[PDB]
């Protein structure tokens, strides 16, 4: 898995489960193209988003549907979503882990990039 | 201003100065429209982004040019920029501060909504 | 004040009000000695913790009573408190702000040191 | 491993490697007693800090030597260390993961608590 996403809930101290994760790539024509999507499992990760063959150099956008998560728990959050935009692999293939820590009025995002 | 932005540099322990901040509003066509922009001052805030008569309810996007900021410091960054997308609701208090804490491979954003 | 503390509540999107903040200094005997304390006001800051003549170089500890704060909100917290331990150096700028962002199972702390 | 610690470096986008982790328990006499210690591996985790038998109810302190980490990389950080103090297992045994995200003038700490 060259692109892994891990989502945590800072209010409950648990993995954020059943959260939708949508990934887009920037296309030749400056639009975002759908690339991959999934839902976080009990571990807070969507398993198998992409492959090493498919995950080529490019600008990627990872959108995490935090609004639907907090609403399904009865909280009206501040953010519409949490997005992470980055250039990938432009020095060769890497494995990326995007971690997102969620609160109703706050989120943080961190990337860990390791040589595959 | 009913909308303030405050940007901090976690590597140097200072306000993030001279960072471009762009604000968009969501229009009927589900496309973003330029609304406000500014450069952070030495306090890490771009002074006077908007006013309470233009800042009506709706969905707003705040884009912080983090990549240019880290490039000016000679530090390689992960993110292309930091974006904050939110709904402003009148029922809620009357002033929004979006705080952003920046590191090269991490950022956090927080909304402080005060009456 | 050469030392300010600012405490934010990430769950409610407001300053964390009425939070106890205790400051200690490290003494020769490697034991902490009470130095300053206060309760955060409605801005999330305990006004006037110290002065520039008492705030000499040394190692300081800032303890924020997060557990009492979350208990008052009826929200079960992980941490017993949040502590920030640091060295104040004159060579460094002349005002310290320790910012703390609180959630029940997470907190982050940041030092903004300005001239 | 009922107590796991994961340390990340927000400047380099990598696990924080070779970081010392010291764990103490609060003793009957109100002093901190040494309970366990280790160094983070290439994954940013110290492996095998404690056991389920040893990790009883109590107040625990996890100290992460962040100062030595940043100094070994040529940075003078703000914090002397990052500490996490919490009550453990007081509702029955749990597995705790303490994550710490490190910058020179900032750190964050998050706990994920899962039923064993």
Swiss-Prot record, chains B, C:
Outcome recorded upon mutating residue 38 to A: In AMYLD1; amyloid polyneuropathy
Originating organism:
Homo sapiens (Human)
Please verify whether the record's keywords include Transport.
yes
Keywords assigned by UniProt, alphabetized? Amyloid, Amyloidosis, Cytoplasm, Disease variant, Gamma-carboxyglutamic acid, Glycoprotein, Hormone, Neuropathy, Phosphoprotein, Secreted, Signal, Sulfation, Thyroid hormone, Transport
The molecule here is called Transthyretin
Q: Which residues carry this modification: 4-carboxyglutamate?
A: 33
Q: What is known of its domains?
A: Each monomer has two 4-stranded beta sheets and the shape of a prolate ellipsoid. Antiparallel beta-sheet interactions link monomers into dimers. A short loop from each monomer forms the main dimer-dimer interaction. These two pairs of loops separate the opposed, convex beta-sheets of the dimers to form an internal channel.
What domain of life does the UniProt record list for this protein's source? Eukaryota
State what changing residue 105 to H does.
In CTS1; amyloid deposit on carpal tunnel; patients show no other abnormalities
Primary localisation category: secreted
Consequence when changing residue 107 to S = In AMYLD1; amyloid polyneuropathy
Q: How the protein is affected by changing residue 49 to R?
A: In AMYLD1; amyloid polyneuropathy
Quaternary structure? Homotetramer. Dimer of dimers. In the homotetramer, subunits assemble around a central channel that can accommodate two ligand molecules. Interacts with RBP4.
Q: Where in the cell is it found?
A: Secreted; Cytoplasm
Q: What happens upon changing residue 85 to A? A: In a patient with amyloidosis
Q: Please describe, based on the UniProt annotation, the reported consequence of changing residue 43 to P.
A: In AMYLD1; amyloid polyneuropathy
Positions binding L-thyroxine in this chain are: 6, 45, 108
Instruction: Specify the effect of residue 101 to M.
Output: Loss of tetramerization
Result for mutant: residue 45 to K: In AMYLD1; early-onset amyloid polyneuropathy
Q: Which GO terms describe its molecular function?
A: hormone activity; hormone binding; identical protein binding; molecular sequestering activity; protein-containing complex binding
Family recorded in the similarity comment: Belongs to the transthyretin family.
Q: What does this protein do?
A: Thyroid hormone-binding protein. Probably transports thyroxine from the bloodstream to the brain.
Documented effect of changing residue 1 to R: In AMYLD1; amyloid polyneuropathy
């Amino acid at each position: 898995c060259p692109l892994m996403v891990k989502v945590l809930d800072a209010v409950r101290g648990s993995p954020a489960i059943n959260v939708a994760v949508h990934v887009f790539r920037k296309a030749a024509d400056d639009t975002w193209e759908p690339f991959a999507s999934g839902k976080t499992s009990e571990s807070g990760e969507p398993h198998g988003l992409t492959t090493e063959e498919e995950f080529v150099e490019g600008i990627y956008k990872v959108e995490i549907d935090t609004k639907s998560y907090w609403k399904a728990l009865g909280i009206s959050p501040f953010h519409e979503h949490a997005e992470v935009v980055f250039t990938a692999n432009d020095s060769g293939p890497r494995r990326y882990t995007i971690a997102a820590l969620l609160s109703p009025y706050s989120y943080s995002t961190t990337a860990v990039v390791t040589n595959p």
